[PDB]
Amino acid sequence: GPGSMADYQGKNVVIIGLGLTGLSCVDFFLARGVTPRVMDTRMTPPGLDKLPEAVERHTGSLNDEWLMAADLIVASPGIALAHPSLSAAADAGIEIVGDIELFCREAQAPIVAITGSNGKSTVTTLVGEMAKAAGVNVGVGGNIGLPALMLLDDECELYVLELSSFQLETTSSLQAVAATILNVTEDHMDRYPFGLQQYRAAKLRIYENAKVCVVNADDALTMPIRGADERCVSFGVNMGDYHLNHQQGETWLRVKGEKVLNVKEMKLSGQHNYTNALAALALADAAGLPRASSLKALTTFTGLPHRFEVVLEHNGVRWINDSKATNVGSTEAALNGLHVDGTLHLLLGGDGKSADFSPLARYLNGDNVRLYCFGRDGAQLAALRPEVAEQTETMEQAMRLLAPRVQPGDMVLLSPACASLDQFKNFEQRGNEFARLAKELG
């Protein structure tokens, strides 16, 4: 076999997808003296604009004869291996990989690999900042806006990748120095018709040939398929190798029975972000990054926008933008362990996508919760507890109802449990508008 010298010259290479990921695949092959073919089911993918002239392209459908003539099919993670054209190619013995597989074959530095339903971007970015604080030339990517292949460089000393279940499904050569599944929550049902354990099985690939597995002590679906083993290091809220310690208003990160940092030294807030910080510290430790610089990064990291982000703290009221919470599991992570001295003013709503909101109910009793429900499916959210709920069409209308009612001690939390597209371009615009209105009203 080729060994570490995968060579694609002379091969008929077919890329599916003209988003940024597929374009990064085009660039990869061109750099190696291979002109691939590309296809996309969209009639006019934006990425068409960026193709060289010599790359043959087919848009508006998949081209079956191109697939069946291929020596190698590179499938963007947005097309299911179950698509009948790809299943037909597989049944013919044609090799199907994805961008992360091509990346793993060529990477010449250790890889930290991060997947999970919620928290991937925060943990990935934070491990990256831990590496930067150590002076390491780290390459951070894998999100849709920074495809892994663009990171490849002999100057890179460490890679930190956010990986989706879809990318993992086509990846066989990953040998992570440290890997985590942060959590597994019901999500992506369309792509996993056999349910939660099928979705999990895709994520479990991340641990294959990983040197260290960083597992979530609070989520058994993050354990390796045959259970915990000698590679496993855990993070959790109450216990685990990395966990949280709370005493009389103070909270500390704790590692192997030793407090390591008072969270007042951090810029992140929220239980879920603290467990993200624990996961990141575990991954950094396992990768060999110096503990002292990793702690320093925990004190400087601002966090990403829209991830339990404090956008205003004024007159004793914390206004928190958790617009990244586009599903029930994410909002559950925001509400679990939430500390509010006064009243929680919780903003829910948008396009709920026919989700079951039942899991949120257990968090909404008690005398100190008010709901402000908006968007397409606002009525379904108010139904969780009508007596403490208001319903408006828009987020602005909801915020104008709650603003005259807040008192010192209160929290205003936008963790909507829904997609934003009924009223916003995306969840970032929703969070930015929440931030603007909090500054106007708070």
> Distance between CA atoms of 83 and 102, rounded to whole angstroms?
21
Beta carbon nearer to Na ion, 7 or 393: 7
> Distance between CA atoms of 388 and 39, rounded to whole angstroms?
52
> Which residues of this protein are in contact with Na ion, per CB under 5 A?
4, 106
Interaction residues for Cl ion, span 282-311 (CB under 5 A): 288
Q: Which of 115, 122, 234, 293 contacts Cl ion by CB under 5 A?
A: 122
The whole-angstrom distance between residue 288's C-alpha and the CA centroid of its chain comes to 23
Q: Which of 12, 59, 121, 432 contacts Cl ion by CB under 5 A?
A: 121
Sheet containing 178-181, strands listed edge to edge, beginning at the edge strand earlier in sequence: 138-141, 158-162, 111-115, 178-181, 213-216, 232-235, 242-247, 250-255, 258-262
Enumerate the known binding-site residues for ATP: 116-122
Sign of CA dihedral 369, 387, 349, 380: positive
> Distance between CA atoms of 33 and 30, rounded to whole angstroms?
5
Residue 215 phi/psi, 5° resolution? -110, 155
Enumerate the known binding-site residues: 116-122
Q: What is the CA radius of gyration of the chain?
A: 23
**Look-up: residue for tokens 């993070």?**
235
**Look-up: residue for tokens 């290091």?**
233
| CB-count exposure of residue 432 (10 Å: 0-12, 13-18, 19+) | middle
Is 63 one of the catalytic residues? no
Q: Minimum CB separation from Mg ion for residue 150, in Å? A: 8
Beta carbon nearer to Cl ion, 323 or 391: 323
Which residue in the list 58, 132, 143, 353 is annotated as catalytic?
A: 143
Q: Which stretch binds Cl ion (CB under 5 A): 12-20, 112-120, 265-273, 391-399?
A: 112-120
Q: How many CB atoms are located within 10 Å of the residue 316 CB? A: 12
Q: Which of 263, 286, 297, 419 contacts Cl ion by CB under 5 A?
A: 419
**Look-up: residue for tokens 């697939």?**
67
Q: Minimum CB separation from Mg ion for residue 418, in Å? A: 11
For residue 427, the partner it binds in Cl ion, Na ion, Mg ion, none, with Cβ less than 5 to 8 A by kind, is: Cl ion
> Distance between CA atoms of 243 and 235, rounded to whole angstroms?
6
| Residue 163 binding Cl ion, by CB under 5 A | no
| Residue 392 binding Cl ion, by CB under 5 A | no
> Site mask, Mg ion, residues 15-34, x = CB under 5 A?
----------------x---
For residue 288, the partner it binds in Mg ion, Na ion, Cl ion, none, with Cβ less than 5 to 8 A by kind, is: Cl ion
Is 143 one of the catalytic residues? yes
Q: Minimum CB separation from Mg ion for residue 29, in Å? A: 11
Interaction residues for Mg ion, span 29-68 (CB under 5 A): 31
Q: Which stretch binds Cl ion (CB under 5 A): 359-367, 374-382, 400-408, 415-423?
A: 415-423
Beta carbon nearer to Na ion, 57 or 105: 105
Number of residues that bind Cl ion (CB under 5 A): 8
Q: Which of 165, 269, 321, 420 contacts Cl ion by CB under 5 A?
A: 420
Q: Which of 125, 427, 431, 437 contacts Cl ion by CB under 5 A?
A: 427
Which residue in the list 58, 132, 188, 353 is annotated as catalytic?
A: 188
Q: Which two tokens stand for residue 13?
A: 């290479």
Beta carbon nearer to Cl ion, 89 or 419: 419
Beta carbon nearer to Cl ion, 62 or 126: 126
Sign of CA dihedral 55, 56, 61, 63: negative
Beta carbon nearer to Cl ion, 85 or 271: 271
| DSSP symbols for 278-338 | HHHHHHHHHHT--HHHHHHHHHH----TTSSEEEEEETTEEEEE-TT--SHHHHHHHHTT-
Beta carbon nearer to Mg ion, 64 or 351: 351
- Give the residues across from 179 on adjacent strands: 113, 213
For residue 24, the partner it binds in Mg ion, Cl ion, Na ion, none, with Cβ less than 5 to 8 A by kind, is: none
Beta carbon nearer to Cl ion, 216 or 343: 216
Q: Minimum CB separation from Mg ion for residue 31, in Å? A: 5
Give the residue among 108, 162, 169, 114 at the shortest CA–CA distance from 286: 114
> Site mask, Cl ion, residues 307-326, x = CB under 5 A?
-------------------x
For residue 358, the partner it binds in Na ion, Cl ion, Mg ion, none, with Cβ less than 5 to 8 A by kind, is: none
Give the residue among 329, 230, 324, 244 at the shortest CA–CA distance from 281: 244
Is 188 one of the catalytic residues? yes
> Distance between CA atoms of 287 and 285, rounded to whole angstroms?
5
Q: Minimum CB separation from Cl ion for residue 10, in Å? A: 36
Helices then strands, each counted (H, E), the chain: 13, 20
What angle is formed at CA 290 by the lines to CA 285 and CA 291, rounded to 5 degrees?
Answer: 65
Number of residues that bind Mg ion (CB under 5 A): 1
Give me the residues that bind Cl ion (CB under 5 A), please: 119, 121-122, 288, 326, 419-420, 427
Residues annotated as catalytic are 120, 143, 188
Give me the residues that bind Mg ion (CB under 5 A), please: 31
